[PDB]
Structures are given as C-alpha cells and as structure tokens.
Write a protein that binds this ligand. Sequence first.
Ligand code: HEM
Ligand SMILES: COc1cccc(CO)c1O
Length: 403
Amino acid sequence: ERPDLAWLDEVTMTQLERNPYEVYERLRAEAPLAFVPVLGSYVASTAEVCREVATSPDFEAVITPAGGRTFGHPAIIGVNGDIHADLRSMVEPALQPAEVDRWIDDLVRPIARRYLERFENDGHAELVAQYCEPVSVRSLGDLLGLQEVDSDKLREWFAKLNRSATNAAVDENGEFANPEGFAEGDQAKAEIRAVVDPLIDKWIEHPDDSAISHWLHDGMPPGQTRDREYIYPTIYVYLLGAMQEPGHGMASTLVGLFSRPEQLEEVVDDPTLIPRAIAEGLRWTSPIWSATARISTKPVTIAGVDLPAGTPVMLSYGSANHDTGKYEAPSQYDLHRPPLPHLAFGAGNHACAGIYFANHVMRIALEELFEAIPNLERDTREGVEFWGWGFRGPTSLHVTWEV
Ligand code: HEM
Ligand SMILES: COc1cccc(CO)c1O
C-alpha cells in the first residue's frame, strides 16, 4: 500500500529469522512505523516510536496473532484493565526486589555450580545447551514449583512454544502461511497439562511456597483458588520467555564479550562489571526482539501515519536498541558504552515484571562461569549463528580453555 516501501513485499520470514537487522536498519530510516506484509502488521522499529506506542494512553496491550494462537486468553501479555491488574498482582510478589534479594543467591548459585561441575574440566563445551539454558530453566522451574520437571524437558517446551508463538508469516490474503507450525505448540501445551494438572490438584488442597501455589491462592477469599484455566496462559507465557530469555541474555553477553577480548578480560578480572556487561548484551542482541504488541483504542497519528482505532503495532524492541539516534555503532558490542536507557525490558504498564530477578540470574550465572573457567576462550573453528525474529539469541556457543 505504501508505494516507496514496495521492497517490503519481498521480505521473507526466513530472512527476518536469520538476520532482521538489515531490513530494520532500512525501516528505521525510511518508515519507523511500517506495515510489513509477511508479518501482516504495522511494526515499530525506532526507540522513539516503540516507547511512544508502549506508553501511549491511546494504545493497550494486544497479543500477536501467532501469540494468541499459542497462548489463548488471558495471557498476561495480551490483556488489560481489571484482568491485567489481577494477573500482575498474582505474579508480582515473588518478583519484588526485596523478596528476590532474600533468596536469589541460594537459588541460582548452587544450580550454576551443579551444571558447571559436569564440564568445567573438559576443556571444551557448548555453553548454550550445557550451561546457559539449564541454569535459566532450573532456577525458574524451582521457583515455580516444577522441581521434578527435568531441565531437558523445560528447554524442549520453551523451544516449541517459541516456534509456535513466532509462527507469524501470513500469505497474500492475511491468513497464516504455515498453519502446521502451531501443532508442536499444541503438543507442548498438552504435555505441560499432563505434568502440571496433578501439581495444581495438590496445591489447591495443600499450598506451599511454590510460585504457582501462590498464584492459585494469593488474594483469594478463604477456601477459594483462581481457576486453573485462568492462570494456565500465564504459566505458558512463563514456560516460553521467562524460561528462555535469561539464558539468551547470558549467551549473547558472552558472545559480545568474546568479540571484544580486551573487555572479556576486564570482566573476568573485575566481576563487578558483570551487570554492565549484561546490560550492553541485552541492548546488543535483545532476547525479546519482537514478541509483543499494542493496539490503538482510538484514531491516532504515530510517526506520520494516521492509524484507525483497532490497529495492532508490533514492538520490535531489538531494532529499537540499535537506533543510531541513540547509539554509536550499535551493531558492535561495547562494554564501555555510556549506560543509557534501553528497551530490552519494554516500557509502560506492560513492561517486564521480572527485570530484577532476571538480571540477578544472569549475573550469578556469569559470576560462577568466570570463577570456574577464568581462561575461557571462544572456539574460533565454529562460528556463532544467531537465530530468531520474535525471540533472538545464539543457537550455540562453542568454547575452549586450557586445562
Ligand atoms: C533477560 C531476560 C528477560 C528479558 C530481556 C525480558 C523482556 C521482556 C519484554 C521485552 C517484555 C514485554 C514488555 C512490553 O511488551 O513492553 C516482557 C514481559 C514480561 N516479562 Fe520479562 N524478560 C526477561 C525475563 C523474565 C523473567 C525471568 C520473568 C519471570 C520470572 C519475566 C516476566 C515477564 C512478565 C510477567 C511479562 C509480562 C508483563 C505484562 O505484560 O504485564 N521476564 N519481558
Ligand atoms: C515472560 O515471558 C514472555 C514475555 C513476553 C512475551 C512472551 C511470549 O510472547 C513471553 O513468554
């Protein structure tokens, strides 16, 4: 429809998944709010537009089409008003900074040590599968009450939910181009139900300190629980992004540091720089790259585009974090970049609820990794490939060290 952007008609889903940064570099210059045909949606690509849409009183949350097919209702990311307020009040207690600080060290540090002991003397490792993902899912899984769900299974679940929730491609008529791509999401949800329904049955009668037990009971009249159908979509939301993203953030931060060997050495030598390294890592390759959206509630003009009411806008925060209006050479990882605001945790009333927790998980994991393997080096025989448009991270991270 927009004539000068006719080249967007030839952008493919595979291209965006393999590397979205060249298309989005053009979008940020040509059309900070642009309709991308293969995605079937307007997309916000700059920091100014993403922040404006995410915080505007004329927009509210909406789930992406593939997200809605994957999660249903009421996914915390896709609802508003009283339901959103209730779901926020449900999840926020265990994520409060004063609460996290009471137990985060005793949670994550023994988990990190357990996985490190399996390989720290091998001299080689694939850190995504052997360390980053397991620590991320084991830490959250224990907090949630899924202690008996193996980390291999949690990792499989977030991979399947990832592919289902980012199965966004549409055809010429706006219909999903790959309808078969939701089936493995449906299979994961069925497996999750078989595992979690007995745990809920038990928590209803015998509450404990697990987060899901508290989701059932907190704030409820005596003897009542939230219906499991009301909380399952937020359980699924956790089993995708809350499980996946801290592992993604760790791994991207390591890849970035390896790209700047002088900076990797600084951080190993001075672990107090790890939080700064992670913040730059999240900006440099945002784990949640383009997974959420908002919808206009009235006619509104954004970046020169007059949008009717009811218009969805995808928030490509991963592109916003390479906005050259804010950052110098954003495609380069730079630990010594001035610490500026970033959008890797989103913005507004639907901004990430788990920032403080996530930052500590990533911090502790990297502290223990560098303590156990100070001479870590990247395996330069194997290149690092990143994959993902909705969620983005390295598919593997082969490293070596002198034993
Ligand atoms: C590095 C790790 C993480 C990153 C980069 C990240 C980023 C994000 C982003 C970009 C959003 C969408 C915000 C928006 O639409 O404006 C989000 C939402 C959310 N995140 Fe995080 N997240 C991470 C980890 C976690 C963890 C570990 C948890 C839970 C323990 C969590 C809980 C949530 C919740 C509940 C929401 C939905 C908020 C709402 O819609 O009201 N996140 N996150
Ligand atoms: C915390 O988990 C999520 C955050 C934002 C988006 C999704 C899925 O679209 C998530 O699962």
